[PDB]
Enzyme design. Structure first.
Site, mmCIF file in Angstrom:
data_model
loop_
_atom_site.group_PDB
_atom_site.id
_atom_site.type_symbol
_atom_site.label_atom_id
_atom_site.label_comp_id
_atom_site.label_asym_id
_atom_site.label_seq_id
_atom_site.Cartn_x
_atom_site.Cartn_y
_atom_site.Cartn_z
ATOM 1 N N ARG A 165 65.477 -77.840 -2.564
ATOM 2 C CA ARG A 165 66.292 -79.040 -2.647
ATOM 3 C C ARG A 165 67.378 -79.028 -1.573
ATOM 4 N NH1 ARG A 165 68.029 -80.406 -8.795
ATOM 5 N NH2 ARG A 165 70.034 -80.733 -7.723
ATOM 6 N N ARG A 197 79.446 -78.847 -6.019
ATOM 7 C CA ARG A 197 78.804 -79.164 -7.282
ATOM 8 C C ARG A 197 79.481 -78.544 -8.504
ATOM 9 N NH1 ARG A 197 72.763 -77.818 -6.016
ATOM 10 N NH2 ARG A 197 72.242 -78.588 -8.118
#
Ligand SMILES: Nc1ncnc2c1ncn2[C@@H]1O[C@H](COP(=O)(O)OP(=O)(O)OP(=O)(O)OP(=O)(O)OP(=O)(O)OC[C@H]2O[C@@H](n3cnc4c(N)ncnc43)[C@H](O)[C@@H]2O)[C@@H](O)[C@H]1O
Length: 218
Positions: free
Chosen positions: A163, A174
């Site tokens: 990803r 994140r």
């Protein structure tokens, strides 16, 4: 064998790994907003190209977009009649509040909000070693959960990829966002009594057993 539930957990905790278990058990729609966004990206749509930049920086996509996406799916998607597993939504308090509103109006309130608890240190190794089959979302881990055919989606032969937001730069952004924006949602559900914590530092099967236990079905 019906559930309407939310999955809350930091990047890497194991939401995508467990969801299939829940799907098979309860036959609920798995609505993963990350997967929906990545679907937009692959169609080359405008929403997709804009979301892609934010996702790759470890940012959050706007509540309005995310609420509309979910509202349409709850509404137009027939598979969401048997029940649903929200994976990655809600992700901020406003999404949580709006979701609450939506489900009141539809008369289908959430039964469970499962928090996957796991310390940040562990999460880095998990994100660093992850390979997904991009045409599904099947996640593997190089160390912890290997493909037998390396870099190949074992059951279906296809190629595995990393990803784009699984860079340790994005990963730091994140996690900070999770703590700043998402983690507060847990208190929201504690205060309505549908929260249950699960120990997501354990291995997969041990986490799932804990899950069943926590759902009060198995
Ligand atoms: N509502 C919303 N509002 C705003 N923006 C939104 C949004 N929804 C999405 N977005 C945006 O889209 C981005 C991406 O969202 P999204 O795709 O939802 O990602 P995420 O929440 O950051 O989560 P991950 O998918 O990284 O984690 P996971 O827990 O599912 O992990 P997995 O099972 O693969 O597991 C991880 C790895 O560890 C492994 N593993 C799993 N469990 C174990 C275990 N128990 N032990 C050891 N190995 C394990 C796996 O094999 C794998 O390699 C967001 O950052 C934001 O930009």
């Amino acid at each position: 064998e019906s559930i309407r539930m939310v999955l809350i957990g930091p990047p890497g905790a194991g939401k995508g790994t467990q969801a299939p278990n829940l799907q098979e058990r309860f036959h609920a729609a798995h609505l993963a907003t990350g997967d929906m966004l990545r679907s937009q990206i692959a169609k080359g749509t405008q929403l997709g190209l804009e979301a892609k930049k934010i996702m790759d920086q470890g940012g959050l996509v706007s509540d309005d977009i995310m609420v509309n996406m979910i509202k349409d799916e709850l509404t137009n998607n027939p598979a969401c009649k048997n029940g649903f597993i929200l994976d990655g939504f809600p992700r901020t308090i406003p999404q949580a509040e709006k979701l609450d509103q939506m489900l009141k109006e539809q008369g289908t309130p959430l039964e469970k909000a499962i928090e996957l608890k796991v310390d940040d240190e562990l999460l880095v190794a998990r994100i660093t070693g992850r390979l997904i089959h991009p045409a599904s979302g099947r996640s593997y881990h190089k160390i912890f959960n290997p493909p037998k055919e390396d870099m190949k989606d074992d059951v279906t032969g296809e190629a595995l990829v990393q990803r784009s937001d699984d860079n340790a730069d994005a990963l730091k952004k994140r996690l900070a966002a999770y703590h700043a924006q998402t983690e507060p949602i847990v208190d929201f559900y504690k205060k309505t009594g549908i929260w249950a914590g699960v120990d997501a530092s354990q291995p997969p099967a041990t986490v799932w057993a804990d899950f069943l236990n926590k759902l009060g079905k198995n």
